[PDB]
Amino acid sequence: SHMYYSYGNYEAFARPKKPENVENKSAYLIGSGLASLAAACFLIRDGQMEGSKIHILEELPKYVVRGGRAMENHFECLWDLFRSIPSLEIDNASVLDEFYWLNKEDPNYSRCRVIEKQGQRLVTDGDFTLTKTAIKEILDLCLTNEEDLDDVKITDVFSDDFFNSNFWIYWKTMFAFEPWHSAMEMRRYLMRFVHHISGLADFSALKFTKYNQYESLVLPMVEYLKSHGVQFEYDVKVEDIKIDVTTSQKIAREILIDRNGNAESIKLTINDLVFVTNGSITESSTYGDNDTPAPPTDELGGSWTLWKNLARQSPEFGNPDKFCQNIPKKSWFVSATSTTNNKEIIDTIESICKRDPLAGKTVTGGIITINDSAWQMSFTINRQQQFKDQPENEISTWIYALYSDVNGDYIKKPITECSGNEICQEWLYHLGVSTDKIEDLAKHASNTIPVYMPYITSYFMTRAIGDRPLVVPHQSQNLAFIGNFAETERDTVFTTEYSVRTAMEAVYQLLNIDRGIPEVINSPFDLRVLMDAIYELNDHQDLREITKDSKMQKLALAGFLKKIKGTYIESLLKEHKLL
Amino acid sequence: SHMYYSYGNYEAFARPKKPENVENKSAYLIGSGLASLAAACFLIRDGQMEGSKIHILEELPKPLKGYVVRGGRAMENHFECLWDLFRSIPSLEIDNASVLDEFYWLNKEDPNYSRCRVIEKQGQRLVTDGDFTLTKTAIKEILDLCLTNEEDLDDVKITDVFSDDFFNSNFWIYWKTMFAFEPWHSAMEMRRYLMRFVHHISGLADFSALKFTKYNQYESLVLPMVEYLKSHGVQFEYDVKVEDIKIDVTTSQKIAREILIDRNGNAESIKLTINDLVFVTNGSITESSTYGDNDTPAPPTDELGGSWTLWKNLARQSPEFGNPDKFCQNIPKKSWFVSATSTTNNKEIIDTIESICKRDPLAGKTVTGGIITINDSAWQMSFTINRQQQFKDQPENEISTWIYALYSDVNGDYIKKPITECSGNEICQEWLYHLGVSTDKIEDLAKHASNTIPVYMPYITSYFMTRAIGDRPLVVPHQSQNLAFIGNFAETERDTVFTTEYSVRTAMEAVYQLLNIDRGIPEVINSPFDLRVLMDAIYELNDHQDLREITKDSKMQKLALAGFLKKIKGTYIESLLKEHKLL
Ligand SMILES: Cc1cc2nc3c(=O)[nH]c(=O)nc-3n(C[C@H](O)[C@H](O)[C@H](O)COP(=O)(O)OP(=O)(O)OC[C@H]3O[C@@H](n4cnc5c(N)ncnc54)[C@H](O)[C@@H]3O)c2cc1C
Ligand SMILES: CCCCCCCC[C@@H](O)CCCCCCCCC(=O)O
Ligand SMILES: CCCCCCCC/C=C\CCCCCCCC(=O)O
Ligand SMILES: [K+]
């Protein structure tokens, strides 16, 4: 139905024929976020649309870290795209090459993932400490149809054993799950990343770009698009799109914009495609400084207002209110980037992560979680420096806190009432810095910039099938929805992969491109991977240990083992350490 | 061990860094087969070896009485190494396009499928054509074979693991003819085939999973590689017969020291260092092939040509170099030996084929979509007509049919002689007979309207001979510093021989190991570990029966299924089973 899914090298390496009649078509891409950028690259590369017919409408005209960071090997659509984007750092190489080599020579992993009691490593760090009841809850969730998970919370499907496991510590902090978030999305994550469970506790599965996501992913694509003549249109806010929703078709007819404070309108025909990135987790963000809190806001911005205006033209365009209203005041809102050249801080980090922060390699290898922090705070030092023109004596630490309405342990205030230096103080406290030194180090030996993001948890809010518009709604002729609030099967939002996937599916479907789209990696269907998951989830126990204290399963196991003794199934189980 | 297996787009699209010290290395590739050429291409593209330091050593120096077809078995999408290679090889047909791009577009424009797979009784379609007619016993035997460890199948034959129900099934007709399996062949390799291609079980009977090049293999695969290699300065050396390679074998090292060659009559010797790599294609299924013509049989032979002599000479220097005798010796005389290429512009023959395969042979698109099997032919004969013409110099009013017989020592039904005693025109008459041509016309249409070239291949079944782990050398034997074995008599995991993929796979593995290239090699496709594929396979193997139909007969299975279903009622597992038609 205008696209199909594939895997393996045949479809990966094959090139689509130029799509029919693309020469008389144009594209309008609302926003210059990564999904729109990705949709424009696919239009250039696989649609062979001329860049002059491709219009990226962005609101803006013309340290803080984190647009994105962690990636994995099985970002199948992202790597398809970025093998074709030249590096801005290596000659005759793609962003993929740069990244692939970088991560070979300095492969990621954490030497200390969770701390407590002011800088001590958690004694069970590395184990999931899941009881058999918790594991059963995990499988039961995977065995639940997604259809049966409308509006279901994480707390509805897990008991306290689960929430007391180390597993949950590692999972909620690395992915930013709150207990009230969508069990649907939690389920997709479990199945989506099962091949990396072996790397969950020590982040051995993660891979990072050289610099921040903008210097390493966005700018390369902007440059790719500029060299192909893509028209970037600034000072343009898209307020509405008039869509004709009939019994047989949906056609976007008109883009209503404010172009430099002036109300204008872009008339569309059936051959003008519109790519809407609906919803935004970064909109309405505010910034503090070392002595000022990022001020809280519940303002809807352009992105949310546009989706709401689209949603009033058809329920098939989604339900933005499920995502941008009723966000619990406890949710993550604040992140901070703390910069310092102070040797005591840097040295304290080294004595925890066991790596020289200033060496230019992995440091924390991903977030260290402060497990007994009131704020449920985690922080990471990536490869330093994360910016191109930053002094090589400086580190930049990124801090976030899952709980926003709880007094700190040292700064007895909610993070939303904290200046940069105060967030720094709470962090240094949990690092174990002598409290007699913390205040001055935060105020005069560091600079910490907080950001308040009202919608940073928005992707994970409990939802129902239908709350997210399909990438190409039923009967849509020239309208697609892209990014992490659009609907596609199996893949997990809050990833850059999801933004590139939806962009590729939108371009391919709307132009009818005759090439397969890589399916979400088939890990949860791979018996090899499933064998490993059991092994790892049970903290490296074989099937005899797993069933030890249970009469019913040790009898079923016995029967099974008599049946499989000396077979290939036995050999597989042994290779995967289950026997 | 100097490699790793991978899958997914990350490693597929990634480029390896230039391997360490490759500027001081050279390569010698014995022969111009596809594996050797494939290796040369990986040397260029991923090794970044200088072309002038790559030396292809080929016997031949650079007279047949008709077009000859072969080498062009089908391909499938999940030839993972092959497409990794040919995405990088320029098409000679389409500008600005790889061989993959050309193949890809062609097979979407003219997808392959068969409209008539098995005939009998002189041109009549098999009534059950389409079905596997597998009994539950037979199905249990297939599954029981896959659940057997490879190690316990040493020297086991296919007749040792299957019984009467299976051998009487359409499945086995389809299977044995399309893959050229003999009942005495390796059950280990049959097992690898079962698992290797389980994702295509739905395409077995109508060939809808097969893909074909535009032209014969040499024009579509080999010649693009040769021009890639020559454009990069690669050295081709003709008139070179390699007789032996001196290998110093020691506790911690195997090193090729010397290549003993006959170069245009003269006994010569290429001296090697550890930095000169040698790639050996050990054994050959086409070695010692002889040709006949429309009036002459291809004369039978037992000669061990150069390839089999070279391997025996290597096997003498270490048991890690394999057992060539398990493959080139004691080949049964009933084995497939003869194929033939029958070329005609005669409208009665062409129209007769059209009436069977339901397509115009001369339109330039799929014709038979792969072999048609004559199920009741004494010879167990099959024949295919690919897209026409398979040769760029051939007239547009001509077709060329490829014909083979699995049984070489059995009288024909019309020409009452074994195929080995038959002239090109006699093979054609036996073929025409089974097409339904009136016997009054068969002699004249085979003798004056057709030109049939037979080929006798002593070793054409040799890939499938019953073997034991260890008979095939590893692609890079343990501790080998500059010696690799490539092609379909070298050992790698899971993959299936008698396929171009296996040749390219070994090539890739050899080059990557010997040069320590830091990029993943695509694993054999993971279909046999894929629950969705295994579900589809149960459905298809039981001729599209959901599980309730499958268990009707066994009141106890009817029960076990009763329980399973309540354990999974309303769950994802149920939904998957319904999606894959088992409920
Ligand atoms: C701090 C942070 C860290 C992250 N880290 C990771 C990570 O480590 N790994 C990972 O996989 N993922 C991560 N993510 C998720 C990832 O960043 C997102 O999935 C992705 O960046 C979203 O891209 P998008 O363009 O689809 O969404 P957006 O970029 O939000 O798309 C909307 C954009 O278009 C513009 N726009 C919106 N509305 C309008 C309008 N009406 N008119 C004009 N312009 C408009 C806005 O400027 C906005 O930026 C992270 C996200 C954040 C916020
Ligand atoms: C496990 C394999 C790949 C996982 C995909 C990663 C993307 C996860 C996503 O939920 C966004 C993360 C949000 C911010 C949390 C802190 C960042 C920690 C981190 O970068 O992992
Ligand atoms: C696990 C048991 C498997 C059950 C039977 C498996 C059947 C495999 C079937 C079909 C393959 C059909 C042909 C696919 C491409 C062949 C390419 C070639 O000729 O080399
Ligand atoms: K899929």
Residue numbers in the entry:
A (entry chain C): -1 to 60, 75 to 591
B (entry chain A): -1 to 60, 71 to 591
What does the published report state?
Flavin adenine dinucleotide (FAD)-dependent bacterial oleate hydratases (OhyAs) catalyze the addition of water to isolated fatty acid carbon–carbon double bonds. Staphylococcus aureus uses OhyA to counteract the host innate immune response by inactivating antimicrobial unsaturated fatty acids. We conclude that OhyA accelerates acid-catalyzed alkene hydration by positioning the fatty acid double bond to attack the active site hydronium ion, followed by the addition of water to the transient carbocation intermediate.
Glu82 in the active site Loop (RGGREM) is critical for activity, and we mutated this residue to slow catalysis and capture complexes that were not obtained with the wild-type enzyme. FAD binding engages the backbone of the catalytic Loop and flips Arg81 out of the tunnel allowing oleate to rotate into the active site. The h18:0 product has advanced ∼4 to 5 Å into the active site and curls around the doughnut shaped cavity. However, in the h18:0 product complex, the catalytic Loop arginine residues flip positions. Arg78 side chain swivels 11 Å toward h18:0 and the Arg81 side chain turns an additional 8 Å and now points away from the active site. These conformational changes place Arg78 behind the fatty acid carboxyl to facilitate the continued rotation of the product around the active site. The OhyA•h18:0•FAD product complex is stabilized by a hydrogen bond network linking the backbone carbonyl of Phe187, the hydroxyl of h18:0, the tyrosyl oxygen of Tyr201, and the backbone carbonyl of Val505.
